Each structure stands twice: as C-alpha cells, then as structure tokens.
Amino acid sequence: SRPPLEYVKGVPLIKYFAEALGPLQSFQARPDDLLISTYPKSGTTWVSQILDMIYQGGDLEKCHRAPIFMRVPFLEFKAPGIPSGMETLKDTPAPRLLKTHLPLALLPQTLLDQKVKVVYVARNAKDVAVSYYHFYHMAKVHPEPGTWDSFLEKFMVGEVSYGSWYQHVQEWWELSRTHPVLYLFYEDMKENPKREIQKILEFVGHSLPEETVDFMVQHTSFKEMKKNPMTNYTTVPQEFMGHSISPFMRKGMAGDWKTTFTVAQNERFDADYAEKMAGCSLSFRSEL
Ligand SMILES: Nc1ncnc2c1ncn2[C@@H]1O[C@H](COP(=O)(O)O)[C@@H](OP(=O)(O)O)[C@H]1O
Ligand SMILES: O=[N+]([O-])c1ccc(O)cc1
Ligand SMILES: O=[N+]([O-])c1ccc(O)cc1
Numbered sequence: 001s002r003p004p005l006e007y008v009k010g011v012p013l014i015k016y017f018a019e020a021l022g023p024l025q026s027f028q029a030r031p032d033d034l035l036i037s038t039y040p041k042s043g044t045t046w047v048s049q050i051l052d053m054i055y056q057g058g059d060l061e062k063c064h065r066a067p068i069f070m071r072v073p074f075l076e077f078k079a080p081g082i083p084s085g086m087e088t089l090k091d092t093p094a095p096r097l098l099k100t101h102l103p104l105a106l107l108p109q110t111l112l113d114q115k116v117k118v119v120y121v122a123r124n125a126k127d128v129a130v131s132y133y134h135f136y137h138m139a140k141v142h143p144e145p146g147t148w149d150s151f152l153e154k155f156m157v158g159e160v161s162y163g164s165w166y167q168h169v170q171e172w173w174e175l176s177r178t179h180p181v182l183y184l185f186y187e188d189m190k191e192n193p194k195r196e197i198q199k200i201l202e203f204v205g206h207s208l209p210e211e212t213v214d215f216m217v218q219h220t221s222f223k224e225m226k227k228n229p230m231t232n233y234t235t236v237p238q239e240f241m242g243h244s245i246s247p248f249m250r251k252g253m254a255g256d257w258k259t260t261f262t263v264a265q266n267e268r269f270d271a272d273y274a275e276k277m278a279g280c281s282l283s284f285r286s287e288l
Helices: 015-024 044-055 085-089 109-113 125-138 148-156 165-175 186-191 193-204 210-219 222-227 263-276
Strands: 006-008 011-013 034-038 097-100 117-122 181-185
Touching: 006 015, 011 015, 015 085, 034 044, 044 097, 044 117, 044 186, 044 193, 044 210, 044 222, 117 165, 117 186, 117 193, 125 148, 125 165, 125 263, 148 263, 165 181, 181 186, 181 193, 186 193, 193 210
Parallel strands: 034 097, 034 117, 117 181
Antiparallel strands: 006 011
8 A cells, every 4th residue: 555665876766666676686697688768658668569569570469468567577576476577577488578677776787797689678767757646646666646737746856756856867878878778759650650660570689571571560559559458557456556547558658748847847847958958969859
C-alpha cells in the first residue's frame, strides 16, 4: 500500500528496487549484452518491443512467446509475489536484451567494463512529467502522487522514483561520447518510426528487407502495442498495476503536455529548465 521512497547514494528509489540492488551486485555482463536505458516514461517499452522483434528476425509469432517484461529482464526490478529481474535473467538466453532506469551512480560497473552496447531513449521533460504522474496512479509500488501541482514540484527537484530527469538525460548524453550508445529521442520515433528503426538496425549491425521493416513499423505503433497483451502490461496482478486507474499504454503522443500544464506551471517550469540545461549540445522538442 504505497511505501515511501528510499534513498541510495543520492538516488530516490522504489523500496523493492533498492532491495533488489543487493542481489544485483553479482550480475556479470557479457560483451554481447545490449542495454536499454531510459529515465522512466521515455519510450522503454516501445524500443524494447522494436529491439526484441529485431532479435527475432522480424517475426511476430516469436515475440508472443512471453510478455515483454519476461523477454527483457528489468535489472533492478523486484516486487512482492513477482520474480525479480535478476531471477528472470537466469532463464534469458544470449544475446540478451536488458532494461534499466538506473542513474550512472548506481549502474552495475560490469556493463561499462564489458563495453555493452546501449540504446538510450530520451523524451521531452514535460511529456515525461505528465506521463509519470498518471503512472504513479496506476503503478501501486510508487508513493502517493498527490495533486498534479505538487507532483510537478517534486519532479523538478528530482524527488520522484529514480531522481532527476535533468541529470539522467545529461549524464547519459555525456557517456555517449565515450561508450557505444545510440542516443534516441521519443519525438523522433514519433515523427518517423521507420527512420529510427533503421537507425537501431544499423547500431546492432543487422540488415532487414524493407518489407520486414514496414512490418515492424506497424507492429510497434502505439495502437498495435496498446491492444497486444504481451506489450500493454494487462497480464500483471491488479494489486501491482491497476489498468482501470490508468492504462500503461495511455496516449502515446508528443505535445499533449499542453492539456495538463497550466500557464503558471509552464512559466515556472521554463525558467527552471533554462537554469538546469544551461549549457547543452543536447536539445529537445516539446511538440510535432
Ligand atoms: N509504440 C508506442 N508509440 C508511442 N508511445 C508509446 C508506445 N508504446 C508505449 N508508449 C508510451 O510511452 C510511455 C511509457 O514509457 P515507458 O515504456 O518508458 O514506461 C507512455 O506515454 P504516455 O503516458 O505519454 O502515453 C506510453 O503510452
Ligand atoms: O517490469 N515489470 O513491470 C514487471 C517485470 C516482471 C514481471 O514478471 C512483471 C512486471
Ligand atoms: O513501478 N513499476 O512497477 C515500474 C517502474 C518502472 C518501469 O519501467 C516499469 C515498472
């Protein structure tokens, strides 16, 4: 019933995920692992499904084996009456696709040392905040969200599960200068998914015929993913995720934060964002 966050090295975390970090210290990466890394609500499930269809040669018979959360072990995950990501990892064959939201301050150092390829997805802060707010309501391991205005204040000082968005997107953007990281944007995927799939294909070093890429484009669109039981999280216990409170596949839009942010909230957020992202080669689009 909505436990408080726990701080581990400056990072606020779901308490079961904090507990999960102990067993995870004995995780050993493989030169052929591939890590999907995002701040929450930035496109994790979307890119996981794309990467997993690439892994199965574009066939969809093969992606229905089990849910996405079984096919792509979530490193730090754990919950009551649900297998930890470390547990699920035991039964995952190489080459493995792995998922995390851990800041670099917590990331198993084995992944950097083994030079593990990373697919990093970033999304504009305002859509992430709105998506995160609704997520808190359905995903019951999170503390109480509160009102949207108070949730928004928490999001700006990084007092939410996994801490600061502004730091996450910046530190992984720096990492990409020195480590194999394909650094993607949710808004790009939204604008031209085929182009982004072709980018992911080239990073993992596969080629596919164009028909298979079109097939993948269709089967990873918001509407297909919303109705697919394997990707929409409807198979987990109600005590864990309340689908009738807010579906995991909620809207899938770039730019709809405008229907949630008030004008005062926007002005404050914009002033704060400019202090935080002061210098940056890194930039985001709020809208298409
Ligand atoms: N194939 C797809 N196309 C566009 N957005 C999708 C997507 N699959 C899921 N998403 C969206 O991405 C979000 C969740 O990201 P994550 O998988 O990292 O938790 C949600 O955003 P919204 O709440 O804005 O709808 C969700 O609806
Ligand atoms: O990541 N998740 O939300 C999960 C992960 C694994 C599981 O068995 C159920 C849900
Ligand atoms: O709290 N949860 O159950 C979560 C949190 C993050 C995520 O990527 C999936 C599941």
